[PDB]
Structure 1
Amino acid sequence: DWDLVQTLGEVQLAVNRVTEEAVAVKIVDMNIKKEICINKMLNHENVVKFYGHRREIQYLFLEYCSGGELFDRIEPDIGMPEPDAQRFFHQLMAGVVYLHGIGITHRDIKPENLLLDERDNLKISDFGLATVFRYNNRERLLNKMCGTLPYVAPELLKRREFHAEPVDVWSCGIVLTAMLAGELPWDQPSDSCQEYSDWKEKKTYLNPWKKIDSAPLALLHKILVENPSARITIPDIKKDRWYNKPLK
C-alpha cells in the first residue's frame, strides 16, 4: 500500500513501500468525473501519466514529476536561458498538438501546470478544467470562462463563443513570454488594461518585450494576436524562424 510522503500542493507524494516507486496522489472530497474520463484518453510523453483512481474521497494516481513545476525554473524579472526556453516550448507544443489531435483543450496552461521529470522533460498537468472541443470530427465552440487571467486569450473575455485551439495557443505565448522575461505582460487582456493596450500599439521598447531577443519576439508578435482567426496556428509555429533556430 502506498505511503504519502509529503504534500506536493491537495496532492501528496506516494511511495510504494514494496517496489519503492513514486507517484502523485490527488485527493478530492465533495467535474472530477470528467477529469478522470479525460485522463483515461491521454497517452503522451509530454502529458502527466494517468495510472488509475479509487473511490473510497476520490484518489487520483498521476505520474510523479520530481523536477517540480516549470514555474520554479523561471528567475523573476530574468526568465531563463533562451535554449532551455526553446526546449520547453518545443515539448509544450508537442503536448498541445497531441491534446488538440484528440479533441481535448486543457484551458489552463501556465507554468504552475507544466511539470518537469528527472531529465527535465515537460508534462502538461491537471485536466480538472480541460474539455472536449472535437467529437466525431465535429468541433464545438467553447462558451465558458476558464483558466487564469494573465494567460487567457482576449476573445474569451469579449465573445459569447470562441474556438478552443487559439485559446491554448495564446496561453502558450504568455508562457513563452514568462520563460524569456521572468514576468507576465499584463493582469488580463482587456483594453481597460494599460499594458495590453501598449502591446497592441507595438510599444516593444517596454517590459517585458525589451528583455526578449527579436527572433522570439517576432513569434510572440504572431501568437499574441488579438483576433483569434488572425492568430498563428501551431502548424505555423512549427515553421517559425526562432522555433527552428538552433540554440546552444
Structure 2
Amino acid sequence: VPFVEDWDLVQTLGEVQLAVNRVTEEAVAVKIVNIKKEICINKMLNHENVVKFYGHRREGNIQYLFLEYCSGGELFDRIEPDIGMPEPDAQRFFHQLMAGVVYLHGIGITHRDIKPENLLLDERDNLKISDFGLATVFRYNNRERLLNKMCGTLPYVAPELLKRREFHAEPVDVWSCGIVLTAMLAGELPWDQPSDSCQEYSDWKEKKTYLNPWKKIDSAPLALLHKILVENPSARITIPDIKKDRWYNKPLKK
C-alpha cells in the first residue's frame, strides 16, 4: 500500500508533536530528540494504563519515538485550581493510576516522575502513564536494587529521596501517587518539598488537617492519604494494601 509510512506533523503537544497518517488518518504522538535506555524501557511496556510505544526511527542525529496519542490531554488540565475535581472522577483516575503502577512495579520498572502533567487521558478518559525518560529498572533477575539518584519533581518526591543516601523504588512512586490524589481532590499541592524546613510539611506531620489542602478533603479519602503520606517509607502503605482501603473500594457516582 503506497504512502502508508508517511505522517503529517499537525501541531505541538509539549518536543512532542501530534502526527496524522497520510492514508489512514490515524493519530499518534511523535517525540523528537539516556535515549537508548528510554527506548529499551518503552519496548518492555504493554498495558492499558501505560502510553503505547509503536516504534522508533533514527534519521541521522534526530531520534523519532512513535507513541500513543491521548486526545483527552493531561490530567493536569482536569484539575481546577483550589478546587480539584468531583470525588468519583478522582477515585476512577486513581484506580487506573494504581493499575498502571502495579504493572510497572511487576515488571521491575519505576517511573520516578509521577505527576498530573505525565498522566494522559485517551478519547474515553482512560488514564495513561507517560514519559519514561527518568524511568529505570529496580528489579532484575528477581534481585531488587536500591536507588540513590535524585530524580523527580520536588512537590511530588518522597522525603527519603532528600534525607537518605539509598532508598527503595516502590514507596517513592506510591508517595507521588498520594500527592497526585491530593491535587485531584483539592486543586493544590500541599508543600514545595517534603522537608522539616517546610512549614506545610511540618503541619501535616503534626496532624493539622483543619488547614488547607486537607480541610477540603472528605474524611474517607483523607484516611487513605494519612497512610500514603507517611514519612518512613518502610511504614508507608503498599499498593496491595491501598487496594483494600475503605475509600478505594467505596462505590461513588456523581
Instruction: Give the aligned length.
Output: 246
Please give the per-residue CA displacement for 1:12-50, whole angstroms capped at 9, x wherever unaligned: 00000101000000000xx11111000000000000000
Secondary structure of 1:241's aligned partner: coil
| Match for residue 173 of structure 1 among 178, 200, 218 | 178
Mapped to 2, the partners of 1:205 and 1:77 lie a distance apart of 16
**What displacement does 1:178 show?**
0.2
Q: Does 1:14 align with 2:39?
A: no
**What displacement does 1:232 show?**
0.1
Secondary structure of 1:123's aligned partner: strand
Mapped to 1, the partners of 2:83 and 2:144 lie a distance apart of 39
Please give the per-residue CA displacement for 1:136-188, whole angstroms capped at 9, x wherever unaligned: 00000001000000000000000000000000000000000000000000000
TM-score, normalised relative to structure 1: 0.99
Secondary structure of 1:165's aligned partner: helix
Secondary structure of 2:167's aligned partner: coil
Q: Which residue of 1 aligns with 2:49?
A: 46
The 5 A counterparts of 1:45-84 are 45-56=48-59, 57-84=62-89
Please give the per-residue CA displacement for 1:181-224, whole angstroms capped at 9, x wherever unaligned: 00000000000100000000000000000000000000000000
Please give the per-residue CA displacement for 1:48-83, whole angstroms capped at 9, x wherever unaligned: 000000000000000000000000000000000000
Q: Give the gaps of 5 or more residues in structure 1.
A: none
Secondary structure of 2:225's aligned partner: helix
TM-score, normalised relative to structure 2: 0.97
Q: Which residue of 1 aligns with 2:153?
A: 148
Give the CA RMSD over aligned residues.
0.4
**What displacement does 1:225 show?**
0.1
Mapped to 2, the partners of 1:62 and 1:194 lie a distance apart of 41
Q: Give the gaps of 5 or more residues in structure 2.
A: 1-5
The percentage of counterpart residues that share the same residue type is 100
Query: Hey, which bits of structure 1, 4+ residues long, moved more than 2 A?
Result: none
